[PDB]
Amino acid sequence: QVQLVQSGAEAKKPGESLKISCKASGYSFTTFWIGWVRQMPGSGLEWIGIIYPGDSDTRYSPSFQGHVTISADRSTSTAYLQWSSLKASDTAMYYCARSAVFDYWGQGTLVTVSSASTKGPSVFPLAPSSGTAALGCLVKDYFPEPVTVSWNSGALTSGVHTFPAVLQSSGLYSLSSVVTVPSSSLGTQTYICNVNHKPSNTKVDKKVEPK
Amino acid sequence: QVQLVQSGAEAKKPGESLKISCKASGYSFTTFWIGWVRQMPGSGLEWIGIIYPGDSDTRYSPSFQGHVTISADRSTSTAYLQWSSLKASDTAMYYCARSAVFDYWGQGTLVTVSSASTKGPSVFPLAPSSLGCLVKDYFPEPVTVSWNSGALTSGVHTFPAVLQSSGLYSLSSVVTVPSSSLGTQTYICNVNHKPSNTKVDKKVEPK
Amino acid sequence: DPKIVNIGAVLSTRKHEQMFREAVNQANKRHASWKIQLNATSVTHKPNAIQM
Amino acid sequence: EIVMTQSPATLSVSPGGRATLSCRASQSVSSNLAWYQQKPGQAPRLLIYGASTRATGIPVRFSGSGSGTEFTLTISSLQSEDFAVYYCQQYNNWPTSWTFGQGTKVEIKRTVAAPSVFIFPPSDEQLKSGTASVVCLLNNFYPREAKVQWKVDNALQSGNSQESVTEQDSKDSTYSLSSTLTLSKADYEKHKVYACEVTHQGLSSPVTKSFNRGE
Amino acid sequence: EIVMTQSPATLSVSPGGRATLSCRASQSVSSNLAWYQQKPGQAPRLLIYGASTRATGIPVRFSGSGSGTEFTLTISSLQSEDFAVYYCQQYNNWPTSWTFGQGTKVEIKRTVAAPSVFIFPPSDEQLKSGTASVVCLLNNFYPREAKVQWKVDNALQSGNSQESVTEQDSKDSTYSLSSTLTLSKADYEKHKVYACEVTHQGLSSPVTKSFNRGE
After folding, report:
1. Which residues 21-50 on chain C approach chain D with CB closer than 8 angstroms?
2. Residue D45 burial (CB < 10 Å; 0-12/13-18/19+)?
3. SS3 for B89?
4. Which of B189, D109, E71, E146 could form a disulfide with B133 if both were Cys (CB 3.0 to 4.6 A apart)?
């Protein structure tokens, strides 16, 4: 009965300073050795830091000292992570775990550090008319990752698909979500795809209709 | 390498007696407990007999004790099965085992005893309005089907045949087609029944 | 499937060899036949020791 | 002389779950048993003999256990190719007994769907013989439990309609149903309105398709 | 400052087999090990600590062993909703060391299957914007090795299409690739014949779903 919800996604140009949260619940906060780990795309996991939130005792990795300063606060148990500045080559995802044998991990909150600028997602519906039921919503060029989709506000989970996006030609990314369903139900149930790009805070709903 | 090819299917009028041949290969025929198993339509299984084909030492089942004529030739490895009489209401299918754990099985041999006789199937069309065909009185079973000589493959639904009270087998072949090709495509149904050697092509068109 | 084993050895005379073969065939019919087969061989006696 | 009880009567799993069947033993039948698989229109095979050993050439999913008291096999991670009828059979005093059972049956699971209803009248060729046949077709529905009713001039009829159900297709796991109404020309000419009314778990209301003679 | 060695890399077991994943230290760590599982698009979980004990709410299929070096984890009866990337880690001088490993990656083995093909043209909003794209997608096949080729105006053109392959699904272990073709409004309007070519072992012939530009 422990949840370690993290904060939302973040993307910013080199130079500024960051701040992310790992607010806990469900247990006596000042008794467990909270820490942090980092995962860059497709290499594995590594350790960065650890802190006992009863004496603010801290320790750091062989080579991470001074780049990032861990903190704590016994008012809502939120264990922050202070970033000094810049660190352009730091695009990765950061997890906060609990008990030194790490047990109860949280969500993911990817931090993007690039030179371009965020652009709102561009959605596109698909019109099915073949006799075999299959349809979806397409997310055109946008930046940056990540983004989430869900059909009918998460009222349909079977058969859903969601491909990994890729950068085609202009530093933007494109998505494609497809799903199938009984054929006879095409003209009797209203379909909506929900798109929420956290960086740009864009949220559109492209309703689809039979061709 | 073991094959247990049985004999071809056959059906007979009530009263007569029949013979069934289960040929074997790939192993020393006179070393293994060959048997037989029965299967009624849409039911379970029952054991008939068994015969060690070295000294014809058989042991019939109590269900049909002293009613069947199991035997086994030693030369050609063709352990037979012969009927005496009373084979009227016993339409089923029969298999031959191999070794008292049934490691290898044969194929399909169906026995149907009925009063009626062979009769060429009759085909009629069925077109939609606002498609397919129905075949009735195909005897003896089975009857094949090929829509437009097997032109279209998807959307076909050849339901299993059923026997009516009049001793006639019935089947129906239907397919779903776009409504924009009804007047632009030819709808044909071809049925070839070896039981009467009847090959009929019926063209179905909308009203 | 059966696994073959080959017990069987020297007897006195050919009639005895055939009797041995029929005996092993009798011993196969009882119990297992789908796991083990145990076909048997034979060979008769000879006067010279080293030849034997 | 021993009755094998096979339970459950009909299971159902999703493509990737597991399974657990039962062959109830009316006696302590030593430690000898077997388990047979059979698909429609084919010769069964052998899976497990002695209740614990695997026959050669059988994939590793199938396994079983039992010690002379309701032995059990567990097909783990049922793929698409599986799900046909099963059978249990014992052999204790052989050759004397050879008692089989009844066996369960496994069918794939899928989300609910609605049928498509079609009606076919006589094609005037069968009617020339003095017999009329009316076809009601239910296409691509799930699950199998559904009811079909014939109304002759808005009157219920019994004992003159036949029904046929196909086998679960390997692709979309549905069923197709046919219902035929056969009658003589004397009954056909005395009525004009015919209706086929279907009621089904996946349908909001009992939906009817009707037609009239000579139209 | 303790390096970690984990081998093999891409173990592949049939969906009833087992596994013998190994993780060997560089020194003599008595008992300070932990194993982790990470499914795609998720955050890992704990299943073993102490190299022998099990965590809370973890099935019995998992178990580990070893000391000093050559740590072993043995998955018994690999079910279907496995196929996650694994990791091993050690904690001797704590808190100072926290050195992870690289870990293997299981991959279930299935039976060959045949894919369907669907296509989608522009939606007249992208066409209004002047940017056109047509997409062809498959569904539930195996293995991933397949070749998809386009055909624009009965001609094979490249340099304007992109393809994507998901990870093996967690219910039946089937990839489903998608491919997209992007071109300007005039470039799309220059032709009226569009099709996707699919070549694989599952299907007998390279089925094609052509689209005729007729709006």
Report:
1. 34
2. middle
3. coil
4. B189
